[PDB]
């Protein structure tokens, strides 16, 4: 018997819905799928659909009806999806598919990807004021999972994350950024599962490790929530008492791990927080040393960027918190993974499905305290055959780090699939995510992207639903 949705959440939700009702309805993004055993035949189907869609009868059919009909075809080896708001975009996109040409709304491949997708759970640097709000108001499944995490977090820390999502006046801090991005991560992944997708493996960075543990079957939703709540509040409370000589900055520098080993001989107190990309590393330490290594970087033409925090996670400054984190996590129950795990806590090494559990109290201490081996995990995934990396986040920050490691590992055409992004319609974005999973042959029931038909006008007069 968990807490319910707070009264203030409901209040904020009613105001938000009026805000939504009084806005101009935008044309939805529809996925149009064509496929064939042969790419040559796929291109002809795309040309035939474009022709019919140019005809008066095609023009008279809604995109949603056309796409619902396409979704009931057999789905062949060679695939394409044209994402469209109207008949113009669709016909344009289909002509590109027919012509073998690239367009920004078009995905087309000769055959499925060989290995299943890696779900990427990062989070840092992805937050913004209204993250998750639009999809909450507009997707029943997304909203159900948000509320499930909101009840658990309510019960664990005593406040409502859903109030933060719904109230535009409020913005996120070191604590609430983590628990709220977690909630968005859980809800995005369960929405994806709802339409048939699943992770082949998971990889986490810093914040996202708790969600990655849930989706890998290493911890119940309750214990994953305990993992992100204890981490988050200790970090925010600890960092707020940091002043003067106790302050520790974090910064991004264009140095590799090997460069760092040599550059750090001038900086005794600097530590590595995150190995982000082959030539991007996040360091932490006392402000004067951080300022000097930044100065050193910019003098060598390398770029460098100070983050906004008075404390540095994944350094020794976390040693005061570990005792309390240990106490708060007593009772969690680590379970055997149900998909692969690239563990950026354990130096980037792989854990097979059915392996021994890894997510014990010591795992969360080690993760908070020690470096995040993100680029090593990604490289390990590339080297064992993975090419599709799907990021669950309000903004696709980590995907840019993945691109750097995949290109550097020789993979020059990875499938980098984002989810949400500020200033992209959150329902469009999720359509596009699931349309890509389909093109590459990953698990996804494209039929579930369209509501159940309730009448013959929900179909179009094309195969497989031609009217007798």
Ligand X SMILES: OC[C@H]1O[C@@](CO)(O[C@H]2O[C@H](CO)[C@@H](O)[C@H](O)[C@H]2O)[C@@H](O)[C@@H]1O
Query: Could you list the active site residues?
Result: 206
Q: For ligand A1ATW, which stretch binds (CB under 6 A), given 12-20, 61-69, 200-208, 333-341?
A: 200-208
C-beta closer to ligand A1ATW: residue 9 or 260: 260
Q: For ligand A1ATW, which stretch binds (CB under 6 A), given 15-23, 52-60, 268-276, 388-396?
A: 268-276
Give the binding site for ligand X (CB under 6 A): 12, 15-16, 19, 75, 167-169, 196, 268-269, 286, 288-289, 298-299, 438, 441-447
Which value, to the nearest 10 degrees, does the dihedral of the CA atoms of residues 171, 142, 162, 4 take? -170
**Alpha-carbon span 364 to 316, nearest angstrom:** 15
Angle between helical axes of 140-157 and 174-194 (0-180°, round to 10): 140
| Residue 236 near ligand A1ATW by CB under 6 A | no
Half-sphere exposure of residue 391, counting CA atoms within 13 Å on the CB side?
24
Q: Who's near 17: CB < 8 A, 6+ residues apart?
A: 137
With CB under 6 A as the contact rule, the residue among 139, 154, 205, 289 that binds ligand A1ATW is 205
Q: Which of residues 309-348 bind ligand A1ATW (CB under 6 A)?
A: 313
305 binds, among ligand A1ATW, ligand X, none (CB under 5 to 8 A by kind): ligand A1ATW
**Order of strands, sheet of 30-36, starting from the edge strand that comes earlier in the sequence:** 30-36, 78-84, 106-109
| Residue 303 near ligand A1ATW by CB under 6 A | yes
| Residue 228 near ligand A1ATW by CB under 6 A | no
Looking at the chain, the number of H-run helices and the number of E-run strands are 18, 13
With CB under 6 A as the contact rule, the residue among 252, 341, 378, 399 that binds ligand A1ATW is 252
Report whether 147 contacts 193 (CB < 8 A): no
227 binds, among ligand A1ATW, ligand X, none (CB under 5 to 8 A by kind): none
Q: Who's near 243: CB < 8 A, 6+ residues apart?
A: 310
15 binds, among ligand A1ATW, ligand X, none (CB under 5 to 8 A by kind): ligand X
C-beta closer to ligand A1ATW: residue 364 or 440: 364
Report whether 136 contacts 166 (CB < 8 A): yes
Half-sphere exposure of residue 214, counting CA atoms within 13 Å on the CB side?
25
| Residue 213 near ligand A1ATW by CB under 6 A | no
342 binds, among ligand X, ligand A1ATW, none (CB under 5 to 8 A by kind): none
C-beta closer to ligand A1ATW: residue 5 or 322: 322
| 3-state class (DSSP) for residue 45 | helix
Nearest C-alpha neighbor of 388 from the set 338, 337, 438: 438
Report whether 103 contacts 58 (CB < 8 A): no
Q: Which of residues 78-137 bind ligand A1ATW (CB under 6 A)?
A: 124-125
180 binds, among ligand A1ATW, ligand X, none (CB under 5 to 8 A by kind): none
- Residue 281 Cα distances to 177, 294, 336, angstroms: 22, 12, 32
| Residue 397 near ligand A1ATW by CB under 6 A | yes
Residues that bind ligand A1ATW (CB under 6 A): 124-125, 205-207, 250, 252, 273-274, 276, 280, 282, 303, 305, 313, 397, 401
């Amino acid at each position: 018997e968990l807490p319910g949705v707070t009264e203030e959440a409901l209040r904020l939700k009613e105001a938000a819905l009026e805000e939504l009702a009084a806005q101009e309805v935008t044309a939805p993004l529809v996925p149009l799928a064509v496929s064939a055993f042969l790419t040559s035949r796929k291109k002809a189907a795309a040309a035939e659909l474009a022709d019919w869609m140019q005809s008066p009868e095609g023009q008279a059919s809604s995109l949603e009806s056309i796409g619902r009909s396409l979704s009931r075809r057999n789905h062949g080896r060679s695939r394409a999806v044209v994402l469209a708001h109207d008949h113009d975009e669709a016909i344009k996109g289909l002509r590109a598919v027919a012509a073998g040409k690239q367009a920004p709304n078009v995905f087309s491949v000769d055959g499925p990807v060989t290995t299943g997708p890696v779900w990427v759970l990062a989070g840092f640097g992805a937050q913004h004021r209204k993250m998750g709000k639009s999809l909450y108001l507009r997707n029943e499944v997304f909203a159900a999972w948000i509320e499930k995490v909101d009840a658990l977090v309510q019960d664990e820390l005593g406040y409502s994350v859903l109030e933060l999502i719904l109230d535009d006046a409020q913005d996120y801090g070191i604590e609430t950024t983590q628990v709220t991005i977690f909630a968005i991560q859980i809800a995005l992944g369960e929405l994806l599962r709802h339409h048939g997708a699943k992770p082949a493996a998971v990889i986490g960075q810093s914040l996202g490790e708790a969600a990655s543990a849930y989706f890998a079957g290493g911890l119940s939703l309750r214990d994953a929530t305990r993992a992100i709540c204890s981490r988050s509040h200790l970090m925010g409370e600890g960092e707020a008492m940091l002043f003067g000589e106790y302050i520790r900055l974090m910064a991004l520098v264009e140095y590799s791990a090997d460069e760092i080993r040599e550059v750090f001989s001038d900086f005794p107190d600097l530590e590595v927080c995150v190995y982000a990309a082959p030539t991007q590393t996040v360091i932490g330490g006392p402000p004067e040393q951080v300022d000097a290594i930044l100065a050193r970087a910019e003098a060598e033409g390398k770029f460098a960027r100070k983050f906004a925090t008075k404390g540095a996670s994944h350094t020794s400054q976390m040693d005061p918190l570990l005792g309390e984190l240990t106490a708060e996590l007593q009772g969690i129950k680590p379970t055997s993974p149900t998909c692969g795990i690239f563990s950026t806590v354990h130096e980037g090494r792989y854990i097979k499905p059915g392996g021994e559990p890894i997510h014990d109290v010591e795992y969360w201490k080690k993760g908070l305290r020690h470096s995040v081996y993100f680029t090593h995990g990604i490289r390990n995934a590339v080297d064992s055959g993975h090419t599709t990396f799907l990021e669950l986040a309000p903004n696709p920050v980590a995907l840019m780090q993945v691109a750097l490691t995949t290109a550097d590992a020789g993979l020059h055409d990875a499938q980098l699939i984002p989810t949400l992004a500020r200033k992209q319609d959150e329902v469009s974005s999720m359509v596009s995510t699931m349309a890509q999973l389909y093109v590459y042959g990953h698990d996804l029931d494209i039929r579930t992207l369209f509501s159940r038909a309730s009448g013959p006008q929900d179909y179009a007069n094309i195969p497989p639903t031609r009217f007798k």
